[PDB]
A paper describes a structure:
[name] [name] 824 gene [name] encodes a putative unsaturated rhamnogalacturonyl hydrolase (URH) with distant amino-acid sequence homology to YteR of Bacillus subtilis strain 168. [name] proteins have been shown to cleave plant-based and algae-based substrates by hydrolyzing small two-chain and three-chain unsaturated polysaccharides containing an unsaturated uronyl saccharide at the non­reducing end. The suggested mechanism for both families requires hydration at the C=C bond of the unsaturated sugar, resulting in glycosidic cleavage. Transcriptional studies and structural analysis of the [name]-derived protein product presented here support its annotation as a [name] family protein with an active pocket capable of binding unsaturated polysaccharides containing an unsaturated galacturonate.
Crystals of the [name] protein belonged to space group P212121, with two molecules in the asymmetric unit and a solvent content of approximately 47.6%, as determined using the Matthews coefficient. The protein adopts a six-(α/α)-hairpin barrel fold with a small two-stranded β-sheet and helix overlaying the end of the barrel near the active pocket. The two tertiary structures align with a root-mean-square deviation of 1.4 Å and contain a highly conserved active pocket. When the sequence alignment was fitted to a surface rendering of the [name] structure, the putative active-site pocket was highly concentrated with conserved residues. The character of the [name] active-site pocket is somewhere between that of YteR and UGL. The representative PatchDock results demonstrate that the conserved residues Asp130, His176, Asp75 and Tyr25 are available for binding the three disaccharides of interest. While the mobile loop of [name] (residues 320–330) may provide some gating action, it is unlikely to completely block access to the active-site pocket. The catalytic site of Cac_[name] is slightly more open than those of YteR and YesR, and not as open as Nu_[name], which may allow larger sugars to fit the +1 subsite, and possibly trioligosaccharides and tetraoligosaccharides. Conversely, the loop extending from the gate loop of Cac_[name], which is not observed in the other [name] structures, may play an important role in substrate specificity compared with other proteins in this family. Taken with the electrostatic comparison and growth on pectin and PGA, Cac_[name] may cleave a wider range of substrates than or a different range of substrates to YteR, including ΔGalA-Rha and ΔGalA-GalA, which may be decorated with side chains or be longer-chained oligosaccharides.
Numbering used by the authors: 2 to 361
The structure:
């Protein structure tokens, strides 16, 4: 049973909201639907993608709900689906919208080591999420339109992020880092947030797999990024839940009351395992592990509804650090956020993992 199509059909039929703001998770979900278009060759999937993005992309290429001057790295992620649409349809408005997003990169603020700040409102901060939204989009953009020298910038951002956010003990990477060490959530020694959040690691491993894929084969930092991906996978396999074969919201604290197996991070990790094996970044010996983990996603997180469609359950709706609610990154904080079903932050990665599983 091909869950990529079944889930795509479920998303469309259940009319999951993908149009209420310029949300990174909406492009992510559409990126999953685009894989279903690719293999089915069924225009209804492409048409759904087009119709969804018509909310945002005006004929003149301006983007509803986007403001460049906010310098929000999340706002770049939806450029990835725009690349796909431009390649598929050749429509100029998508290219103009892409030019507008690329202009953000010109002056988006950077840390002392030249990594994009997560947002203007988060000065001096690197969050793992941003590597997927920003650096990874930038890589896809450069592959299509850019100058190859720009890949050096992108790879440097991955390398510096691993240097600053990695825990030497576990090999896992913390959710966020404040170079200025001024945020109350940031460790006075290291600037790091307190915990390993499942979805944050998921963002980083997806970002690695998707970025390495578009690098020139001879790129000077290609092996370094592959090594980082292997190291992340090693670290994640150490904390995989033995019974379920999936991952917890707070990755290394599975025995702690309140923690839970979380669908979006688990799906992202399974996608990266599968894609990493397919492209040769990870050893072929991991194939059965990856397959078993995929089946674990279905077992733990998928339920059939009476109409024969499916729900994806147990998705952390949102998490972050600081901000108006002064989010402190404690265990209690990560457990406090909503757990929801049929949320695009989980749906997209589940579609993508399904596509990779089916391809294997």
């Amino acid at each position: 049973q091909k869950y990529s199509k079944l889930m795509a059909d479920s998303i469309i039929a259940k009319n999951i909201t993908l149009t209420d703001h310029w949300g990174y998770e909406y492009g992510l979900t559409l990126d999953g639907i685009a894989k279903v278009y690719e293999w089915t060759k069924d225009k209804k999937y492409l048409d759904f993608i087009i119709k969804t993005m018509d909310t945002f992309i005006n004929e003149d290429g301006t983007i509803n709900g986007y403001k460049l001057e906010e310098y929000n790295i999340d706002h770049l992620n939806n450029g990835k689906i725009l690349i796909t649409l431009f390649k598929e349809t050749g429509k100029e408005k998508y290219r103009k919208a892409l030019i507008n997003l690329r202009k953000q990169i010109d002056n988006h603020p950077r840390t002392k080591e030249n990594v994009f700040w997560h947002k203007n409102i988060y000065p001096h901060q690197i969050w793992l999420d941003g590597l997927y939204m920003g650096a990874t989009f930038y890589a896809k953009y450069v592959k299509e339109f850019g100058e190859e020298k720009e890949f050096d910038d992108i790879t440097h951002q991955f390398i510096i992020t691993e240097k600053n956010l990695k825990d030497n003990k576990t090999g896992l990477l913390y959710h966020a880092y404040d170079e200025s060490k001024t945020e109350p959530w940031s460790n006075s020694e290291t600037g790091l947030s307190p915990h390993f959040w499942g979805r944050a690691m998921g963002w980083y491993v997806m970002a690695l797999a998707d970025t390495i894929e578009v690098l020139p084969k001879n790129h000077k930092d290609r092996n370094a990024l592959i090594k980082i991906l292997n190291n992340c996978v090693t670290a994640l396999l150490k904390v995989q839940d033995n019974a379920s074969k999936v991952w917890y919201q707070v990755l290394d604290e599975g025995e702690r009351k309140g923690n839970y197996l979380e669908a979006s991070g688990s799906s992202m990790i399974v996608y990266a395992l599968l894609k990493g094996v397919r492209l040769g970044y990870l050893p072929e010996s991991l194939k059965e592990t990856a397959k078993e983990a995929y089946k674990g996603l279905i077992n733990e997180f998928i339920l059939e509804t009476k109409d024969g469609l499916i729900n994806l359950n147990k998705i952390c709706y949102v998490a972050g650090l600081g901000g108006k609610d002064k989010r402190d990154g404690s265990f209690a904080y990560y457990i406090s956020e909503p757990i929801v079903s049929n949320e695009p932050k989980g749906l997209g990665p589940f579609l993508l993992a399904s596509y990779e599983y089916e391809t294997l």
